[PDB]
Design a protein around this ligand. Structure first.
Ligand SMILES: NC(=O)c1ccc[n+]([C@@H]2O[C@H](COP(=O)(O)O)[C@@H](O)[C@H]2O)c1
Ligand SMILES: NC(=O)c1ccc[n+]([C@@H]2O[C@H](COP(=O)(O)O)[C@@H](O)[C@H]2O)c1
Ligand SMILES: NC(=O)c1ccc[n+]([C@@H]2O[C@H](COP(=O)(O)O)[C@@H](O)[C@H]2O)c1
Ligand SMILES: NC(=O)c1ccc[n+]([C@@H]2O[C@H](COP(=O)(O)O)[C@@H](O)[C@H]2O)c1
Ligand SMILES: NC(=O)c1ccc[n+]([C@@H]2O[C@H](COP(=O)(O)O)[C@@H](O)[C@H]2O)c1
Ligand SMILES: NC(=O)c1ccc[n+]([C@@H]2O[C@H](COP(=O)(O)O)[C@@H](O)[C@H]2O)c1
Ligand SMILES: [Mn+2]
Ligand SMILES: [Mn+2]
Lengths: 257, 247, 243, 249, 232, 260
């Protein structure tokens, strides 16, 4: 298929849906879906929903709200207490699924009460219209430039649950602890970082190519994260996303581990 | 002349050509030519061609194809066997000219079979042995004129650093083979994967000599052992780092 | 407010001014104002003024003049003799105010003699800072520039060379040239954010702390090059840049 | 307050004891006591005991045995099962005292068997007092400079210059020590020292290894990051980390 | 062994003892050849040398079994030393050796001996390798392994030395050595400290940049810098 | 078993030899033999021979001569022309054996003319240390016992190791390599190799020092270029490659190396 027919199929789904609620993350995919829904259905038939929670930063929430307002959409923030679900609070390995379940359950509630016919999300190759129309990554960038979309959150965040071992209980304080630690490291010029939480040990993951520059901050980072509540502040020798940059022989050894 | 005149004339040349095939590298120049062709003639009358070969990386090829796709052009990959020409195979100083010759000859074949009236490249003020046309250079475009018109048209994305031919990593007179080319390309691909986008693996038979910008060599130390063993599995006996730095 | 609202606030202000003179430094902010002024009012109603002086680099001046032409503006160079004011010449702590005064006084002269309704800056009261009137933040400046296709501007700005001298030290053509050659060489090695602070026979180099690790490979060349410029001791500040 | 008077006191206490067993660590203090006992009492009246256990490396044990042999002493190794005491096994803060108590209790068994009149230690001027072990250097009012002065006088130039600690220092209070995690810690430290880092600790935090190095060596350590990461993981750690505080942070 | 014959001729000696290997051998040979009661070891105390260097030398001379005597010199009372002129070394040498001769005259010593390589050790054609062999030979295991120079080297010529700026320089260098950099100078330029390190250690130093910056500032410096030329 | 037993064995071998010539390099092993020979047999019954040749530095020769004198031995320098043998001259893979052969022939000639019954060398586990079951740890333990404090702390090899097999040795390429190594040691790197690959110099450093080397990159590059090299490079495996790696990547660098 061509981009023109991939765009066809998508206007057809929106025209048929009439009124929609869109899960808006601020990324290129949700930006394109939100912009196409606005273009095809008009401002009065689209409501953009951005989720706020303890497992995502306030900064990403504020940015997502401002991006959706920019597109000229009616935007609604909704607050989720993910920690009320025991799977999330005790970080079971399927915590991801119960968070998504609670997330989509609240969007469906919003959509039922605003008269929207469906919830739309960004997913590419609830209704993922881009993925139904066989949109690839190259197709989303082509139509975004085509429609003049230049602004979107370029950095996709994870759930802070990523920083805790399975079985570790998440609390309001340890979450804030991890997030303050990561925010401080980014302020020193390390935008890609993780502070992994191991109770009284902080284990920092950095891209290995920056480990060398970092040394000048060892003492400042050590004492700052200690005031955040950690007793031991450490640097993971494997780096961020360990094993990914290794030779063929030691990539199959780190992966077997 | 004013920029509008240089642009206006360029639109006139495109209007007269009606249908064009564009040699697309991904740089600022070819991006500007491809965008003007799409604007003046429409998507159905423009074909973007990106060359794939043993002397250039798959990554550079994919980026150029995706950029032409991102501009709304119908883009077409074409593969050239540069090593079938003895001038390129034996890495003579004029190997570049026979490579450009072979590319422009294949561009004319593509244009003949799609009904294009001319081939366009990004050259600014072998290309004429093939009758390919530099429309920017006919319209008296300079580098500042190219950036001025690109900003005017909203072009923010293009390959900012033109990559070189891998023949650059072998001394003149060294015979290029599929194995030594593949060896160098895998080594550079591995080094770039570690976060060193500007890197050179110069080939000295059983010695690999790595050129890095001096300002990044400090950052490299953590990878010494992994780079040493990886390039040895590629076939090198000694893996070395040039103390002089890049170029 | 949305960016569209802030943009409209700015198109309206420019439309009301009709004719403007723009103090153009080449940075992201001055690039956005100059491009918006050209877009709303047209080339014939906008004048780009680039200041040439001894306290800012020739490189900064050359880039700004060619960038203003690349944006399609009529650009005009003006030269300011900052060292003619004794506060600047002897680098008293209020030297900045007299420098800004002399600059804005010359822009107002340029605007009066071409009939511009105001002087606009990138950010005096005789000038209008339209971006801050429309409540533009740094993130907004970036967004609107990407929206309009603006890709070229000086990404690191060098400021006034007077900042490199202690208060009370007299600025001279030779010590200025000494500092400027030293900083020019360091930037040539790949350090665009740098200061060479002048302490007579001591050079005190400020670098962003995250770059000092990478700098070691240049110690000996930097030492010998800055000594040939006239320094006797070439040092690196352990506090880093902005110490 | 004279060195000659302090030595005189030492030969008198040894002469009076007649037969002794000496707890020999290989340090300057135990070397000086062992050398003075040999000179005053003769080789047949002195037995040097070196402790072998899971909490010290085999290299440290072999070194002490050969050092005691080099002084001309009859030396006998004895092995202690420290992990049999619950205080040592579960790493309570008094583990040192129960380890030392068990050590001194075994010394008295050896001394009772060979007819020694006392057990002698290196201490200079806890569970030693309960066991009746004698600090002759401390009774003769030996200070550190007095021990160095007499060692120079006797030609003693060789002794362990760095006394190592119990491996228990690498485990948190409350963590249970096992034969495997001890072996894990010791192999990790042995590998790091082989790379040229003689002062190092691998602190044990279950699935995390936390390496303490002197901060002045951390810069040079970078070249070994990947090799250290994968080697300590093959020893059983899941995460291999470097303490940003450095050694003894 | 030109050495033992030279000592017998002096009969009674006072030894200028610095605590280094050279001075350590002289005191030990003098004590052995002439006896404890006929040798007097003098350790100099002054503002231009570290307390640690002095304390080690006094305690080490006692540990060798010698009668040790401290003597205090006020080098800054000499105008050449106080204003750090280029010949300050020579006027310092005068005060040091003049006070030893007073002590030697007052205890009946026949001469003052120093180390180097009346330096009887240097007269016997001893090299650096010869000093290490003979010290182990006599069981000598202890001595100050790092000899410091006069603190005056850290000040520019013409700068007036004060009790405070000397102490300032001494505390700064004491701090840097504590971090594992035994060869270091902090050169004094009023409000600027200029640190000299061996170039091979500058990489290893980076981890201490911030702590060194804040520590030397509390010592009184406003600017704490690292010399790109390295040490000497 | 014990050190006293192994040492006792040595004095017995020396007493039985009566008169000895000692091949003295200045290292700990030869220093131990030379001092024990002097101690057991006396100065008049031991002869120390130090070899000087074109494949070893003047500094190594001078240190060995000065150290053996410091132990009180009668020392004799002898000069070997290794380059006169074509196997050494053209750096064949067995060049080591013809060099050792020519060396030992001259020691035996010296020993015949001194009335010595054998030549003694420093080999460990007539190599008396190796016969007396001395290991590296026993030689270090016994050396401290006798007060041996001075010896060549970093033993250099023959310069032939710095050339690929088949490369012809000349005074100019030898002087080129040795000058490069002496310059690097002058910067504070006592263990270094400058391997010669025609227009490429490949520097081997202990991996624990390479980060510290960055400050010298430019000076080393330009200095070795004035020595005649066109490219000055650093081996990423370092000196003694593969000996410090982890378990799995040591056995893989083993099959990498044994592939040539
Ligand atoms: N199972 C899923 O579909 C899913 C989705 C999103 C995130 N995650 C989690 O995100 C984590 C990734 O961690 P980092 O991105 O911080 O490195 C993984 O633990 C992964 O389990 C999982
Ligand atoms: N004629 C061309 O189009 C062209 C362009 C860029 C580089 N080159 C070649 O690339 C080489 C430079 O190699 P490096 O950029 O890897 O250093 C030169 O030999 C040069 O001849 C040729
Ligand atoms: N006092 C002011 O309003 C004013 C204005 C502009 C610049 N400055 C000076 O600019 C200098 C900036 O120094 P840097 O060289 O570190 O950027 C400071 O001296 C600062 O005082 C001051
Ligand atoms: N209480 C004691 O007398 C005693 C004795 C031996 C070791 N220790 C322990 O040794 C530890 C120090 O060992 P590290 O070298 O690993 O830091 C301390 O926790 C200290 O409590 C204590
Ligand atoms: N001029 C002399 O004869 C003499 C004698 C002894 C020491 N010194 C001093 O030793 C100093 C050595 O300087 P450093 O601080 O770099 O070690 C010289 O500056 C010099 O002032 C000089
Ligand atoms: N019998 C032997 O194999 C033997 C003996 C002595 C020296 N060598 C040579 O000495 C070299 C040592 O090389 P480097 O010390 O320079 O690294 C060996 O690679 C080897 O070429 C070999
Ligand atoms: Mn870096
Ligand atoms: Mn180092």
């Amino acid at each position: 298929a061509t981009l023109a027919t991939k765009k066809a199929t998508l206007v057809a789904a929106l025209k048929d849906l009439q009124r929609v609620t869109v899960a808006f993350s601020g990324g290129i995919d949700s930006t394109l879906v939100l912009k196409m829904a606005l273009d095809v259905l008009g401002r009065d038939n689209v409501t953009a929903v951005v989720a706020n929670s303890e497992l995502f930063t306030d900064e990403e929430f504020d940015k997502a709200m401002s991006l959706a307002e920019e597109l000229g959409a009616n935007v609604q923030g909704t607050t989720l207490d993910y920690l009320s679900d025991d799977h999330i609070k005790n970080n079971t390995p399927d915590s991801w699924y119960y968070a998504k379940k609670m997330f989509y359950s609240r969007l469906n509630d919003i959509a039922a009460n605003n008269g929207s016919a469906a919830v739309l999300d960004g997913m590419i190759k609830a209704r993922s219209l881009l993925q139904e129309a066989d949109f690839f990554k190259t197709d989303v960038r082509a139509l975004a430039q085509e429609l003049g979309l230049t602004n979107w959150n370029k950095v996709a965040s994870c759930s802070v649950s990523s920083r805790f071992p399975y079985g570790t209980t998440l609390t309001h304080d340890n979450i804030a602890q991890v997030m303050a630690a990561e925010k401080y490291l980014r302020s020193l010029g390390f935008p890609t970082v993780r502070v992994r939480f191991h109770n009284d040990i902080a284990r920092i993951e950095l891209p290995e190519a920056r480990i060398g520059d970092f040394l000048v901050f060892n003492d400042r980072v050590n004492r700052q994260l200690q005031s955040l509540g950690f007793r031991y502040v450490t640097l993971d020798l494997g780096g961020f996303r360990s094993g990914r940059m290794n030779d063929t022989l030691t990539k199959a050894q780190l992966a077997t581990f």
